[PDB]
Amino acid sequence: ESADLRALAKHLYDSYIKSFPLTKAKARAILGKTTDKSPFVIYDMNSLMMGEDKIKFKKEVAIRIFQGCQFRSVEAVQEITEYAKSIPGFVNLDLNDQVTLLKYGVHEIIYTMLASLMNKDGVLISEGQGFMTREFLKSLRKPFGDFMEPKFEFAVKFNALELDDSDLAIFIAVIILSGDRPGLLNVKPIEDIQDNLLQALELQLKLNHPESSQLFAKLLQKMTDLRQIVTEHVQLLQVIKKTETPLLQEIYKD
Amino acid sequence: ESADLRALAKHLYDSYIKSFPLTKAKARAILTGKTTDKSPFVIYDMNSLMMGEDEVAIRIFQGCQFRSVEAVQEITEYAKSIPGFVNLDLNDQVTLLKYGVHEIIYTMLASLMNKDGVLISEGQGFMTREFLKSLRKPFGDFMEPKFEFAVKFNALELDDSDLAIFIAVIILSGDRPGLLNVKPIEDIQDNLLQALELQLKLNHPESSQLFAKLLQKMTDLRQIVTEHVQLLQVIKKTETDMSLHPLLQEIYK
Numbered sequence: 001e002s003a004d005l006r007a008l009a010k011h012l013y014d015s016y017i018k019s020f021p022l023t024k025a026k027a028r029a030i031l032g033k034t035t036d037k038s039p040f041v042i043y044d045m046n047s048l049m050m051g052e053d054k055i056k057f058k059k060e061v062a063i064r065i066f067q068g069c070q071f072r073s074v075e076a077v078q079e080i081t082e083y084a085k086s087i088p089g090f091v092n093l094d095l096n097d098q099v100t101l102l103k104y105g106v107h108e109i110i111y112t113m114l115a116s117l118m119n120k121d122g123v124l125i126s127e128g129q130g131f132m133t134r135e136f137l138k139s140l141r142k143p144f145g146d147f148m149e150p151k152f153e154f155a156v157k158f159n160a161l162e163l164d165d166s167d168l169a170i171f172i173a174v175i176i177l178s179g180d181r182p183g184l185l186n187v188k189p190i191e192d193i194q195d196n197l198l199q200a201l202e203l204q205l206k207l208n209h210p211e212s213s214q215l216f217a218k219l220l221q222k223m224t225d226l227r228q229i230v231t232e233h234v235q236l237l238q239v240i241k242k243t244e245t246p247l248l249q250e251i252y253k254d
Numbered sequence: 255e256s257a258d259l260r261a262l263a264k265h266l267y268d269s270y271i272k273s274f275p276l277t278k279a280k281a282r283a284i285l286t287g288k289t290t291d292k293s294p295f296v297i298y299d300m301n302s303l304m305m306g307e308d309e310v311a312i313r314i315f316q317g318c319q320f321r322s323v324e325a326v327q328e329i330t331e332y333a334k335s336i337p338g339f340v341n342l343d344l345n346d347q348v349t350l351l352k353y354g355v356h357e358i359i360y361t362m363l364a365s366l367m368n369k370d371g372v373l374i375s376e377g378q379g380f381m382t383r384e385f386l387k388s389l390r391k392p393f394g395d396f397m398e399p400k401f402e403f404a405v406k407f408n409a410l411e412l413d414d415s416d417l418a419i420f421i422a423v424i425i426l427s428g429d430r431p432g433l434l435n436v437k438p439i440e441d442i443q444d445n446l447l448q449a450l451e452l453q454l455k456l457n458h459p460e461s462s463q464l465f466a467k468l469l470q471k472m473t474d475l476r477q478i479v480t481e482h483v484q485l486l487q488v489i490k491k492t493e494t495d496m497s498l499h500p501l502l503q504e505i506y507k
């Protein structure tokens with residue numbers, strides 16, 4: 001029934017709003033033009049120095065930035081974890097499976113949601129208070145110059161679909177309820193749920209983007225691009241391990 | 255109009271049948287015991303390999319190469335039948351084939367597989383999964399991920415008419431590295447995706463969201479290709495005397 005799919009769609013949009021403080025609509029207004037404020041721009045080493053001193057950020061510079069992405073990605077995991085629980089049926093799943101789906105899904109959500117904060121020239125930083133340019137990130141080092149580049153390329157491609165928060169809220173849920181995560185114990189109810197969410201997403205895009213033909217298919221094929229980016233992210237973290245050689249190390253276990 | 259989509263579905267299926275001599279329907283008939291087709295000789299060890307022939311790890315490897323070269327040429331014929339494909343920039347035609355070819359091969363190879371092995375030699379033979387594992391250190395690994403994919407993919411229970419549209423969709427992907435005109439390619443794929451969407455709903459009415467589940471397999475396919483390339487580079491260096499087929503070299507370049 002199309003009413004229940006629409007009900008599922010709004011539920012999720014309502015949860016998403018409560019879970020994620022900095023929304024795409026907001027990020028876009030900031031990027032985009034709503035000149036009621038302005039983010040501090042970081043475009044080289046000197047602008048970074050002021051960036052710290054001016055707005056509060058709670059060794060080598062290339063390292064210090066990388067460690068900031070870690071801090072922020074840990075914050076995002078809690079936000080995504082909170083959102084997951086609102087997805088109808090998710091908390092009724094076996095607890096090991098809940099943890100499994102969060103464990104593997106979280107990086108895909110992060111880069112998906114990152115794209116909302118990125119344009120072709122840079123990324124909003126620190127609750128949108130800043131803007132780190134793409135050039136500045138390119139110019140970091142032999143290891144750290146390629147950390148963000150693949151994520152900018154995906155964003156450019158992802159953002160060309162012009163999804164909004166109402167669309168994304170349902171896409172994110174689809175991602176979490178992936179029944180192919182390794183080590184899952186009861187795959188059926190996960191797929192039962194994802195199938196329900198895929199119906200709601202399908203209907204969401206049709207009503208919200210009636211002229212955008214086959215957008216559902218294009219977005220689902222963007223799931224390969226997310227998976228490939230996540231794959232080649234740990235491929236950098238393996239090399240970081242052999243370059244960046246205590247109780248904080250524990251907090252950012254992964 | 256759906257009628258236009260049904261016409262495209264029919265057209266692609268027809269070309270599929272004309273391009274691929276060993277269909278899934280034929281493959282399944284041979285595997286299950288249908289008396290339309292005849293039973294395969296089974297290769298499960300060295301003597302059974304010696305009998306069927308009436309160093310082996312390399313022999314099997316060069317055998318898979320010859321079959322991929324053969325498949326590439328079949329896939330190339332199929333592609334040309336795809337409305338709009340031959341009208342594309344020639345450079346892109348080659349690029350779409352370069353990256354789409356192996357993804358098609360592993361998709362269609364699933365059709366020839368069950369959990370316990372794979373049809374060979376136009377369905378005359380059947381080589382067991384376990385036998386393929388028992389091969390030399392660098393050659394014992396190549397087929398497993400293909401089997402693990404096939405088991406998952408075959409569970410969707412697509413038929414040749416479904417596969418015909420899906421492989422069309424794979425070929426006309428506008429995200430291939432180095433394409434010149436993404437728009438004409440994506441316009442055609444939209445049309446194909448619509449057709450597939452209608453094909454699946456009609457052909458598999460009781461099968462919820464098969465379209466979405468099918469598209470998500472394109473993830474699994476791309477991983478299979480990367481694992482394989484990695485694994486070929488190991489053999490380049492291990493086996494200095496082993497030759498890869500020119501057509502396969504230029505694809506992997």
Ligand SMILES: Cc1oc(-c2ccccc2)nc1CCCc1ccc(C[C@@H](C(=O)O)n2cccc2)cc1
Nearest residue numbers: 313314315317318319321322372374375381482502
């Ligand atoms: C296990 C087996 O053995 C034979 C075979 C064929 C003829 C003679 C002896 C064995 N075919 C198969 C499997 C089906 C054919 C087949 C297998 C694998 C591939 C992928 C293919 C590729 O990546 O291009 N390849 C090349 C070398 C190793 C893999 C393409 C085609």
